[PDB]
């Protein structure tokens, strides 16, 4: 389980580290959820964790850990380990461990300033807010590691392709490939933003940075990145969940198509974060807007492919008429439940994002509590639940340590409570956002400022309690799954529950075109030059670097 899958070991470390970050980061969830209920439980937190200086030190830690660190580490896990298991190949073990250390040494550096109130700038870290040099350098080493995750997986792909000249890229790998490529093109924004700017600044080598270019480069990445968070779930949802659901993945071509489109359309859409920015052409905003509606398409596709599989599943599990099939599914299995309730919260998370996405309609909600409400249904719910409810098939598969009845029911509680608790937050936050309460604010330290949002503040108070319980019940879970000195004489050589994939004739024609990964990668690159090219070139000739500020 170690010296024949040391790919298991190294995969486990991306997960554990992944899960540390998630814990430490979520700690602040409650206090913030309570904050948006006008309860100020920070005197407590501050007393309980003595290092915390501000609400915003916590927001920083919450975001930077739960959305930069837990995610990337989980992505790295799934999007290397799953393909490697399908191909039955060992990835380059050097470069596999380099990566890991690259993220560890990355994280430690970045945390040093963060924990010391020296980089309280949030996970967007917008200039001219100016953090400690080690936070920029840190995040930079943390991200560049993904570039090794790219190389490693591109290599597995190359190697499988060599011993199968002509043949079509197997499914999970095709997914993982378009994913790494899409992330490579996406990552260029923030990598540029770093190298050409944030590092120079933070060290001392220059004295100004241009807010428009920085937030622009930065956003060329921070939209793709949410697709980067999601796809590893999406992998799991298409190719593993169908099996545990009792049925089969009902289409291989849609799975690839859906993934392709992500390669195609994840990157050129960042002016969806810059709708309220100065110095960017309405023409180009409206352009990015449309291509953003175009990126709804894969996810729309998915709903129906996935819904189909789980109906099929149902119809096999001993299903029934209009609804029945839902009752029929393995509801006592945390690994089915977690990502299904995930999808449940995704339904409304999506209708947020289309609303979000649509230009004129975005100034109804930009920078209100709606956006947190929106993304929490996306990434804190689904992506996280999938990740969570997957410890239960992946962690036995990585340690050969089986899962009891006690733990299976503990999970089921953690899961159902993390769900509704999130659901509830999403009523509150969307609702306050409409009623104009802003995001990113310590609003319980201005008790009288938002009196007209008494009602949804109840929800936000309630979420924070419910979800505090959930989290601790979770830490209880995770540590029990991993410490019980139990080791099975076989289950470690009892692989991932990959799904049977319905297929046939018409696939060959359609599948082959899609397996043209060079051509579609080139299209994608070209797309990006079109979209960001004229805006970027324009800004770069007209640079206006302003000095930095520390307002904490």
């Amino acid at each position: 389980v170690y010296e024949a899958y040391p790919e298991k070991k190294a995969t486990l470390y991306f997960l554990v580290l992944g899960f540390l970050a998630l814990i430490v980061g979520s700690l602040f969830g409650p206090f913030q959820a309570l904050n948006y209920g006008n309860v100020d439980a920070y005197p407590l937190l501050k007393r309980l964790l003595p290092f915390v200086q501000s609400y915003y030190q916590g927001l920083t830690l919450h975001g930077v850990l739960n959305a930069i660190v837990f995610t990337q580490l989980f992505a790295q896990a799934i999007m290397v380990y799953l393909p490697a298991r399908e191909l039955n190949m060992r990835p380059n073990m050097g470069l596999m461990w380099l990566s890991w250390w690259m993220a560890f040494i990355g994280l430690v550096v970045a945390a040093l300033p963060l924990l010391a109130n020296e980089a309280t700038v949030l996970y967007t870290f917008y200039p001219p807010l100016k953090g400690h040099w080690a936070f920029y350098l840190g995040a930079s080493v943390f991200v560049l590691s993904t570039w090794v995750s790219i190389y490693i997986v591109l290599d597995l792909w190359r190697r499988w392709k060599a011993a199968n000249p002509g043949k079509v890229t197997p499914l999970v790998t095709y997914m993982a490939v378009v994913f790494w490529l899409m992330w490579f093109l996406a990552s260029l924004g923030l990598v540029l933003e770093a190298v050409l700017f944030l590092l120079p600044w933070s060290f001392g080598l220059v004295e100004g940075v241009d807010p428009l270019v920085a937030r622009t480069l930065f956003w060329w990445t921070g939209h793709p990145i949410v697709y980067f968070w999601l796809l590893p779930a999406y992998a799991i949802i298409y190719t593993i969940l169908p099996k545990q659901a009792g049925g089969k993945l009902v289409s291989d071509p849609m799975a690839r198509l859906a993934f392709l489109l992500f390669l195609l359309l994840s990157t050129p859409v960042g002016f969806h974060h810059q709708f309220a920015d100065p110095g960017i052409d309405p023409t180009w905003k409206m352009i990015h807007s449309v291509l953003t509606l175009f990126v709804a398409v894969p996810s729309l596709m998915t709903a129906f492919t996935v819904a189909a599989s789980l109906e099929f599943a149902g119809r096999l599990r001993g299903g029934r008429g209009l609804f029945g099939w839902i009752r029929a599914l393995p509801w006592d299995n945390p690994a089915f439940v977690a990502p299904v309730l995930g999808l449940l919260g995704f339904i409304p998370g999506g209708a947020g994002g289309i609303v979000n996405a649509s230009f004129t309609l975005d100034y109804v909600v930009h920078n209100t509590a709606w956006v947190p409400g929106h993304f929490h249904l996306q990434v804190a719910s689904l992506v996280t639940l999938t990740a969570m409810g997957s410890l239960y098939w992946l962690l036995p598969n990585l340690t050969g340590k089986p899962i009891s009845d006690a733990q299976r029911r503990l999970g089921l509680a953690v899961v159902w409570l993390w769900f509704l608790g999130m659901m509830i937050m999403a009523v509150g936050l969307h609702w306050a956002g409409l009623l104009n309460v802003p995001r990113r604010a310590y609003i319980a330290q201005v008790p009288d400022a938002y009196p007209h949002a008494a009602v949804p503040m109840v929800f936000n108070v309630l979420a924070g309690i419910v979800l505090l319980v959930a989290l601790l019940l979770f830490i209880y879970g995770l540590f029990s799954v991993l410490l019980s000195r139990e080791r099975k004489p076989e289950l470690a050589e009892a692989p991932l529950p990959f799904a049977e994939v319905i297929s046939g004739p018409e696939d060959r024609r359609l599948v082959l075109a899609m397996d043209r990964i060079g051509f579609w990668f080139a299209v994608a690159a070209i797309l990006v030059v079109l979209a960001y090219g004229p805006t970027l070139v324009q800004l770069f000739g007209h640079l206006n670097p302003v000095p930095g500020w520390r307002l904490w």
């Binding site: 110095g279 309609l361 104009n436 604010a441 201005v446």
Partner: protein, 166 residues
């Protein structure tokens, strides 16, 4: 079975997209529309318009609060606002009603957000650049301002007042 359900999946996966696409197109047709009408004023100006934040309130239009408001058309008034670490100058901003108010906004420190509670004036303000936006207050009264981009430890407490006289 089995294959009697590899065609029939694709069948309505086509049909779904026709419907996915038509719909998203109606959105596109309704958004396209807002462009043609008055509501479009709140889209910032596309044209770069650079300034120096370290001087901004000590020369040029942003210097004296008593100068913020200038007449600029037959029914148009330009208002040069200043968002800055934990406030807005002028405070309050005083503007006439039913006249096309044309805000020009910037900051001397960090990015703030400029959000006229009750309207669509929801523009990001950026150091060194000038945020130009156009709105007409048809219904008079006291309009509040919230900085909705985090700007430091006094972010929660950064409010302004728009005073639309009649």
């Amino acid at each position: 079975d089995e294959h009697k359900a590899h065609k029939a999946i694709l069948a309505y996966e086509k049909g779904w997209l026709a419907f996915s696409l038509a719909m998203l197109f109606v959105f596109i047709a309704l958004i396209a529309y807002t462009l043609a009408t008055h509501t479009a004023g709140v889209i910032p100006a596309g044209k770069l318009e650079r300034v120096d934040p370290t001087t901004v309130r000590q020369e040029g239009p942003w210097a004296d609060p008593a100068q913020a408001v200038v007449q600029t058309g037959p029914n148009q008034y330009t208002v040069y606002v200043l968002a800055f670490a934990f406030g807005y100058q002028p405070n309050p901003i005083e503007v006439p009603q039913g006249a096309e108010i044309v805000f020009k906004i910037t900051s001397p420190d960090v990015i703030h957000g400029f959000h006229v509670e009750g309207t669509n004036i929801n523009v990001e303000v950026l150091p060194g650049e000038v945020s130009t936006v156009r709105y007409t207050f048809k219904r008079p009264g006291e309009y509040r301002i919230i900085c909705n981009q985090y700007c430091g430890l006094g972010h929660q407490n950064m409010f302004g007042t728009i005073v639309v006289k009649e």
